[PDB]
Design a protein around this motif. Structure first.
Motif, PDB file in Angstrom:
ATOM      1  N   UNK A   1       0.818  -1.364   0.044  1.00  0.00           N
ATOM      2  CA  UNK A   1       0.114   0.008   0.001  1.00  0.00           C
ATOM      3  C   UNK A   1       0.978   1.127  -0.165  1.00  0.00           C
ATOM      4  N   UNK A   2       0.505   2.078  -0.778  1.00  0.00           N
ATOM      5  CA  UNK A   2       1.263   3.322  -0.849  1.00  0.00           C
ATOM      6  C   UNK A   2       0.117   4.547  -1.005  1.00  0.00           C
ATOM      7  N   UNK A   3       0.548   5.827  -0.766  1.00  0.00           N
ATOM      8  CA  UNK A   3      -0.254   7.107  -0.898  1.00  0.00           C
ATOM      9  C   UNK A   3      -0.125   8.125  -1.568  1.00  0.00           C
ATOM     10  N   UNK A   4      -0.908   8.605  -2.332  1.00  0.00           N
ATOM     11  CA  UNK A   4      -0.797   9.755  -3.584  1.00  0.00           C
ATOM     12  C   UNK A   4      -1.367  10.768  -2.876  1.00  0.00           C
ATOM     13  N   UNK A   5      -1.130  12.071  -3.124  1.00  0.00           N
ATOM     14  CA  UNK A   5      -1.519  13.503  -2.811  1.00  0.00           C
ATOM     15  C   UNK A   5      -1.663  14.377  -4.007  1.00  0.00           C
ATOM     16  N   UNK A   6      -2.713  15.216  -4.054  1.00  0.00           N
ATOM     17  CA  UNK A   6      -3.078  16.014  -4.940  1.00  0.00           C
ATOM     18  C   UNK A   6      -4.315  16.996  -4.995  1.00  0.00           C
ATOM     19  N   UNK A   7      -4.241  17.950  -5.994  1.00  0.00           N
ATOM     20  CA  UNK A   7      -5.486  18.799  -6.057  1.00  0.00           C
ATOM     21  C   UNK A   7      -6.289  18.419  -7.315  1.00  0.00           C
ATOM     22  N   UNK A   8      -6.083  17.578  -7.838  1.00  0.00           N
ATOM     23  CA  UNK A   8      -6.549  16.817  -9.132  1.00  0.00           C
ATOM     24  C   UNK A   8      -8.150  16.699  -8.907  1.00  0.00           C
ATOM     25  N   UNK A   9      -8.883  16.256  -9.953  1.00  0.00           N
ATOM     26  CA  UNK A   9     -10.215  16.297 -10.194  1.00  0.00           C
ATOM     27  C   UNK A   9     -10.886  15.002  -9.097  1.00  0.00           C
ATOM     28  N   UNK A  10     -11.976  15.095  -8.830  1.00  0.00           N
ATOM     29  CA  UNK A  10     -12.867  14.279  -7.707  1.00  0.00           C
ATOM     30  C   UNK A  10     -13.509  13.400  -8.600  1.00  0.00           C
TER      31      UNK A  10
ATOM     32  N   UNK B   1      -4.948   9.618  -1.014  1.00  0.00           N
ATOM     33  CA  UNK B   1      -5.774   8.304  -0.880  1.00  0.00           C
ATOM     34  C   UNK B   1      -4.731   7.229  -0.804  1.00  0.00           C
ATOM     35  N   UNK B   2      -5.124   5.866  -0.899  1.00  0.00           N
ATOM     36  CA  UNK B   2      -4.153   5.004  -0.399  1.00  0.00           C
ATOM     37  C   UNK B   2      -4.426   3.973  -1.729  1.00  0.00           C
ATOM     38  N   UNK B   3      -3.386   3.510  -2.520  1.00  0.00           N
ATOM     39  CA  UNK B   3      -3.631   2.649  -3.482  1.00  0.00           C
ATOM     40  C   UNK B   3      -2.430   1.641  -3.634  1.00  0.00           C
ATOM     41  N   UNK B   4      -2.611   0.438  -3.992  1.00  0.00           N
ATOM     42  CA  UNK B   4      -1.655  -0.719  -4.087  1.00  0.00           C
ATOM     43  C   UNK B   4      -0.913  -0.961  -5.216  1.00  0.00           C
ATOM     44  N   UNK B   5       0.287  -1.155  -5.114  1.00  0.00           N
ATOM     45  CA  UNK B   5       1.224  -1.570  -6.278  1.00  0.00           C
ATOM     46  C   UNK B   5       0.934  -2.615  -6.940  1.00  0.00           C
TER      47      UNK B   5
END
Ligand SMILES: C[C@H](NC(=O)[C@@H](CO)NS(=O)(=O)Cc1ccccc1)C(=O)NCc1ccc(NC(=N)N)cc1
Length: 247
Positions: A134-143, A157-161
């Motif tokens: 599990x890893x995390x991503x951050x941003x001001x991108x579209x919802x 949010x958290x996503x998996x490799x």
């Protein structure tokens, strides 16, 4: 960021917000970035390829909101804009999508550490987290893909490799994904990065340490089944990073 949760910069102190100055007087958001050292921010080349003029950019650190100020934020100019020379964009794939921005305040200083401004560690040579991590991503991108506006508050949010083998399958991306890229997604395909999250960090805990494992680069749609987000595999560009950040 599709799904996930709203967060503050205190929780992602290495996140850098990059804006472009305009011909009139307005400033628009371009992409995300990560502070890897007091004077360097790492991002994606596709963000600047059409306008390689360093003077048109502004970099904000310690900022939690898109169109408003945050206490403790710091504004920087871009001293040097380094784009990858072998960058190219195919049907879907963006190759060598990585860029370096040397920053400096109006006083000619680099960033100063604080509770909202910290650096993120680079990975070790060919040492990436095991797939399924599990890893995390951050941003001001579209919802949402149908949105034309970006969220005002920073999201995460958290996503998996996902393995290169799985991502290279016919229903996924086939031969378009290379070993210089990393695929990551939500096992339920509910959360993902989206337009506007480009250049941002894919952070993974590698041996108890927070590491900048990838950079938001590309993907077919957002949060679609079998269409993971694709990230620039940072560990493969270390030689390029070192050679350009020295002098
Ligand atoms: C410039 C780059 N382009 C693309 O990723 C193109 C293929 O080159 N695919 S796209 O048009 O489907 C991206 C997109 C998605 C939704 C609305 C507008 C554009 C881009 O938009 N990068 C940011 C981006 C990164 C990941 C995703 N997708 C995902 N995580 N599944 C969506 C956007």
């Amino acid at each position: 960021i599709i799904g996930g949760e709203f967060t503050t910069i205190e929780n992602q102190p290495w996140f850098a917000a990059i804006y472009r100055r305009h011909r009139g007087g307005s400033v628009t958001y371009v992409c995300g970035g990560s502070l890897i050292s007091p004077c360097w921010v790492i991002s994606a080349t596709h963000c600047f390829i059409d306008y390689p003029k360093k003077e048109d950019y502004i970099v904000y650190l310690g900022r939690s909101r898109l169109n408003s100020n945050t206490q403790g934020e710091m504004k920087f100019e871009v001293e040097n804009l380094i784009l990858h020379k072998d960058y190219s964009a195919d049907t879907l794939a963006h190759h060598n999508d990585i860029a370096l921005l040397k920053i400096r305040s109006k006083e000619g200083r680099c960033a100063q550490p604080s509770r909202t401004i910290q650096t993120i560690s680079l990975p070790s040579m060919y040492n990436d987290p095991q797939f399924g991590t599990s890893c995390e991503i951050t941003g001001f991108g579209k919802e949402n893909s149908t949105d034309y506006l970006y969220p005002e508050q920073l999201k995460m949010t958290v996503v998996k490799l996902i393995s290169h083998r799985e991502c290279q399958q016919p229903h996924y991306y086939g031969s378009e994904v290379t070993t210089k890229m990393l695929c990551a997604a939500d096992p339920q395909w509910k959360t993902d990065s989206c337009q506007g999250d480009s250049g941002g960090p894919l952070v993974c805990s590698l041996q108890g340490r927070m590491t900048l494992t990838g950079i938001v680069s590309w993907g077919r749609g957002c949060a679609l089944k079998d269409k993971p987000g694709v990230y620039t595999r940072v560990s493969h560009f270390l030689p390029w990073i070192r050679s350009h950040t020295k002098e």
